[PDB]
Design a protein around this ligand. Structure first.
Ligand SMILES: [Mg+2]
Ligand SMILES: [Mg+2]
Ligand SMILES: [Mg+2]
Ligand SMILES: [Mg+2]
Ligand SMILES: [Mg+2]
Ligand SMILES: [Mg+2]
Ligand SMILES: [Mg+2]
Ligand SMILES: [Mg+2]
Ligand SMILES: [Mg+2]
Ligand SMILES: [Mg+2]
Ligand SMILES: [Mg+2]
Ligand SMILES: [Mg+2]
Ligand SMILES: [Mg+2]
Ligand SMILES: [Mg+2]
Ligand SMILES: [Mg+2]
Ligand SMILES: [Mg+2]
Ligand SMILES: [Mg+2]
Ligand SMILES: [Mg+2]
Ligand SMILES: [Mg+2]
Ligand SMILES: [Mg+2]
Ligand SMILES: [Mg+2]
Lengths: 154, 227, 46, 394
RNA sequence: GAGCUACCUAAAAACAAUUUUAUGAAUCAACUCGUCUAUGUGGCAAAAUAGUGAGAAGAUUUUUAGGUAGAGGUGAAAAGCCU
RNA sequence: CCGCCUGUUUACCAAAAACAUCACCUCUAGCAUUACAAGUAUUAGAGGCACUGCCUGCCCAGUGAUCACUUGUUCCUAGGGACUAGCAUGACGGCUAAACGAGGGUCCAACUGU
RNA sequence: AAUUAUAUAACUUAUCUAUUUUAUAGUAUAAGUUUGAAAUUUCGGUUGGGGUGACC
């Protein structure tokens, strides 16, 4: 069954050259320190990762590992990699500036309970703003444009 | 100065004396830690090519008689002495082998499936799909190398053309030609894992030395701040 | 424990470790003999 | 298929020949003239060496195929160490014989008469056991390689004392370590026996026949059992360089031409080196049968036929504690076919003279549980031993 | 340079009496180790003596020969040991 | 009080609460002629850690309820398709358990030139 | 920490063979890139000795 889902989502897995497949796997192992079983889990769960080039997958993983403070198991369980970087930064940064999110400290503790990752990403934007952040739709649109300008300057 | 003890050139059923290593190479330096001592042991040569026709005999299926089922110090499974014609040889013993039984070694890829009794050796093609097997051979005529441990069995998942898919105990699937022999049934000593060592002295008997007393994701430049 | 007694004599060990046949077995040992011959030693080996 | 013998232990391959040899027309310069090896000259090639005369201490045997007695057809030889996998069943097939359990009635009756009883028989037997196991040595516990031979010689001496009653016992003698052999065929198989006897008792007169001609003929109904898939020749020694010989144990002209009993011992101290009971009995049949056949062939030539006068031979075997008795009658010499008149054998198995012996008293809490000496002595076994000895006189 | 010491290979060896049982059990010699105190401090001794203590059929102790060498070896890790 | 227990360690100032240890847990590996091993996933190597039972066990997509919407992820152009029904949480505490110790403390009796 | 790093591990381009109608296999070597087992070298000054500050 795992092959069936992979074939449907990513028909080119057979067509892709050897080099391309190895790099995606090698990044997950040497640079991301994923275990053997998780590697099979990720490939089956989100086949689109194979299409994605390296040096973008590594950045996305480190964004969660360091900036968001997530752990290996959390990433695998929630299908974090499936989502796009733009969505991750737009939502996470908005919450962080509002003070509703905290990077876990060195000890591993947080003064305030952080919002569940499903609420941050899985839910719709309307529910996410209305419930998780309790903000206004107009403010988010302004923030997205402001964030775009900052990236351009960067 | 180290000389390997594995120098005998002719097959026999007589026990052979073994020399221990200590975990040292032929140079004399430790290569593997945790090995040393134990009880003295004798080696009994096991023949893993089930379908070996006797000298000056044609290649057709033959039968053999089970003389003994015996404990072996060098393995987790138990072995059985089997005699046929004018020849005796050791082999591995399945779960339910008993003394005095007769067993069949076959060379015939039946166009239809051959009824399978535990312990008989048949080419993989003949056996029906889903039949447990052990002592599997990767290549025809090589000799068994997989699934020869105690209580372990494999499964014949599928057959297409002249190639079959086997499910190893680790569950990693594998494929081979259908012209390589295999023997039906699980390996003996199904309850090996249940043992309890009990005291430290028992491990020293088996030839195991104690452990030693002594007690990496690099962030990218944008990750340095929130490390 | 009391030290000073590390020499536990054994003729078989002595001749095998430092003897004539042992010295000639390697080129480094052969050069040991040549140095002692040039100095003039009365005892080339054990 | 796994190959036995790791490469590192095998002899190393010869050095490659110098490239100067490849070049045609060029004579290499070697160190042969110097008479010693040097690393910077070519290695000579020497022709094979011949001494020019024979030195006995450095004799070298010719290969098997060059031996004058090499024969393409194989001969299977049965000797002392051979241990038959199938036991008696295989032994019976090889000798074309039928088995009857229990000793012959005539022999058994010899000892039921109290006139044949020895004086103080039970007490004297107990003394022999104690002497064999404890008293004969200066050591605390003697070993089997000593007392197993000793018990048998002492018992023969006890029975041999009956010459006072029967003067006719002076017509037999005994020899030590005699050898026996025979060649015969079974269903196209060439078979030979090469063996030895611990002691052999020979008589001046043949033993009485056990079975009448009517019983001999009735054996034709019996069929020899088979043991497929195991071949009859399992555990026999296949030889391609052999000679055909027959040997009773003595050369022609011996005054005592009739062998009476054959004795076989299991004196090895270590258990794995000692035959098990069934395998001991199988050895006794073949060794005794060879003695009978060699005696027949001697009298009636090499022809095959049903014998007018059957030949009877006895055999006794022990490890020093357990005893086994055998009587054989040879009825026919035509063994090529598996159907016809069959030979007959009577066996009495696993007869215990004593169960156990203590060389030191067993003490628990300063109480002597077991005294020294034999345990559970059975006098019946000796009477069977005595009966066989007396047979042919009384 | 592994005749000391650390670990390993091969061939050998020792273990009384008593109570339990059926054993890395118990009491306690031989033997192995070294808790505590005093004497000694160019000492009998460059680590001992006198008492007193721990184990003592086991992961026990002991003998003979062989192996691993300094950018290294060995280590039931004390940064211990390798004349 | 500490450590489960018999064991081990700084030869020459430390013998212990340290090290090892049965038990339990994590990671890596589908294979032959010199170690692992003449072995093959109930196997081998590396590492962590007292055991035992006993509370605390939750990132399955939400609501309807095996069914419809709302989500999410994707494409083809705000429209149109594709995918998400071959599965389904977890993380602490107090526990100790009798036995055992030339381990560190407290106490009674007897005993004595302390 | 600075400076290197044919220890391994990967790739890439040549070179040399096979084939193939361009083409995929491999590779006694050279040049790059990625990992880093290791290698060589260093530890400014005044402020008591520190601890935060500073200062030249
Ligand atoms: Mg540790
Ligand atoms: Mg000195
Ligand atoms: Mg030594
Ligand atoms: Mg010594
Ligand atoms: Mg004792
Ligand atoms: Mg010590
Ligand atoms: Mg004690
Ligand atoms: Mg004690
Ligand atoms: Mg004890
Ligand atoms: Mg430490
Ligand atoms: Mg320290
Ligand atoms: Mg020194
Ligand atoms: Mg302790
Ligand atoms: Mg202790
Ligand atoms: Mg030690
Ligand atoms: Mg000290
Ligand atoms: Mg102590
Ligand atoms: Mg001390
Ligand atoms: Mg500890
Ligand atoms: Mg203590
Ligand atoms: Mg008081």
């Amino acid at each position: 069954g795992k092959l069936k889902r992979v074939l449907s989502v990513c028909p080119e897995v057979f067509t892709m050259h050897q080099r391309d497949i190895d790099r995606v796997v090698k990044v997950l192992r040497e640079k991301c320190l994923f275990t053997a079983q998780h590697i099979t889990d990720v490939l089956h769960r989100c086949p689109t990762v194979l299409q994605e080039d390296p040096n973008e997958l590594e950045y996305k993983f480190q964004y969660a590992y360091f900036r968001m403070g997530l752990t290996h198991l959390d990433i695998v369980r929630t299908n974090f990699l499936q989502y796009s970087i733009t969505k991750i930064k737009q939502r996470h940064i908005y919450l962080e500036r509002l003070g509703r999110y905290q990077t876990p400290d060195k000890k591993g503790q947080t003064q305030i309970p952080n919002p569940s990752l499903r609420n941050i990403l899985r839910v719709s934007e309307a529910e996410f703003l209305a419930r998780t952040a309790c903000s206004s739709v107009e403010e988010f649109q302004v923030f997205k444009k402001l964030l775009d300008q900052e990236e351009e300057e960067e | 100065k180290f000389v390997s003890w594995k120098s005998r050139t002719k097959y026999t059923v007589k026990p052979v004396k073994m020399r221990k290593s200590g975990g040292r190479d032929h140079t004399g330096r430790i290569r593997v830690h945790g090995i040393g001592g134990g009880h003295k042991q004798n080696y009994r040569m096991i023949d893993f090519l089930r379908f070996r026709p006797e000298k000056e005999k044609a290649p057709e299926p033959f039968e053999e008689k089970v003389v003994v089922v015996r404990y072996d110090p060098c393995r987790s499974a138990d072995i059985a002495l089997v005699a046929g014609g004018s020849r005796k040889r050791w082999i591995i013993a399945t779960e339910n082998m008993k003394a005095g039984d007769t067993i069949l070694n076959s060379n015939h890829i039946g166009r239809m499936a051959v009824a399978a009794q535990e312990g008989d050796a048949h080419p993989l093609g003949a056996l029906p799909v889903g039949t447990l097997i052990n002592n599997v051979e990767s290549e025809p005529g090589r000799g068994a190398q997989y699934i020869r441990a105690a209580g372990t069995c494999g499964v014949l998942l599928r057959k297409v053309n002249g190639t079959a898919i086997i499910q190893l105990p680790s569950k990693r699937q594998m494929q081979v030609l259908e012209s390589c022999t295999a023997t039906v049934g699980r390996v003996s000593n199904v309850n090996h894992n249940q043992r309890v060592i009990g005291k430290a002295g028992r491990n020293r008997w088996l030839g195991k030395r104690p452990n030693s007393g002594l007690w990496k994701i690099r962030p990218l430049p944008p990750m340095k701040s929130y490390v | 424990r009391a030290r000073g007694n590390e020499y536990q004599p054994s003729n078989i060990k002595r001749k095998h470790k430092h003897g004539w046949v042992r010295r000639l077995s390697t080129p480094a040992g052969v050069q040991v003999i040549l140095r002692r011959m040039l100095k003039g030693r009365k005892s080339l080996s054990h | 298929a796994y190959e036995w013998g790791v490469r590192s232990t095998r002899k190393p391959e010869p050095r490659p020949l110098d490239r100067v040899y490849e070049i045609p027309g060029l004579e290499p310069i070697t160190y042969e003239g110097k008479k010693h090896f040097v690393p910077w000259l070519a290695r000579p090639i020497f022709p094979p060496w011949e001494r020019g005369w024979n030195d006995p201490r450095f004799h070298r045997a010719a290969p098997i195929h060059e031996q004058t007695l090499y024969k393409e057809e194989p001969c299977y030889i049965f000797h002392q160490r051979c241990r038959l996998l199938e036991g008696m069943k295989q032994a019976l097939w090889l000798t074309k014989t039928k088995l009857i359990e229990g000793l012959p009635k005539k022999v058994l009756s010899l000892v039921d008469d109290p006139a044949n009883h020895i004086e103080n028989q039970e007490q004297r037997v107990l003394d022999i056991i104690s002497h064999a196991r404890l008293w004969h040595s200066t050591e605390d516990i003697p070993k089997r390689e000593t007392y197993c031979p000793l018990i048998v010689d002492s018992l023969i001496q006890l029975c041999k004392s009956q010459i006072l009653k029967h003067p006719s016992l002076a017509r037999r003698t005994s020899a030590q370590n005699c050898t026996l052999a025979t060649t015969w065929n079974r269903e196209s198989l060439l078979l030979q026996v090469r063996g030895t006897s611990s002691t052999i008792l020979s008589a001046k007169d043949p033993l009485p026949v056990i079975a009448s001609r009517e019983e001999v003929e009735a054996t034709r109904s019996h069929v020899l059992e088979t043991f497929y898939p195991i071949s009859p020749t399992i555990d026999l020694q296949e030889c391609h360089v052999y000679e055909v010989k027959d040997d009773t144990g003595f050369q022609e002209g011996y005054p005592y031409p009739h062998p009476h009993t054959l004795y076989f011992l299991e004196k090895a101290n270590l258990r794995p080196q000692r035959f098990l009971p069934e395998q001991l009995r199988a050895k006794m049949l073949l060794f005794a049968f060879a003695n009978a056949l060699a005696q027949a062939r001697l009298l009636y030539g090499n022809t095959a036929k049903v014998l007018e006068q059957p030949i009877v031979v006895q055999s006794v075997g022990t490890d020093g504690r357990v005893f086994q008795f055998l009587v054989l009658q040879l009825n026919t010499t035509d063994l090529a076919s598996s159907e016809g008149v069959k030979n007959l054998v009577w066996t009495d198995s696993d007869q215990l003279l004593y169960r156990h012996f203590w060389c030191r008293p067993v003490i628990k809490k300063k109480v002597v549980v077991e005294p020294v000496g034999p345990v559970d002595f059975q006098p019946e076994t000796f009477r069977k031993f005595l009966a066989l000895y007396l047979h042919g006189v009384v």
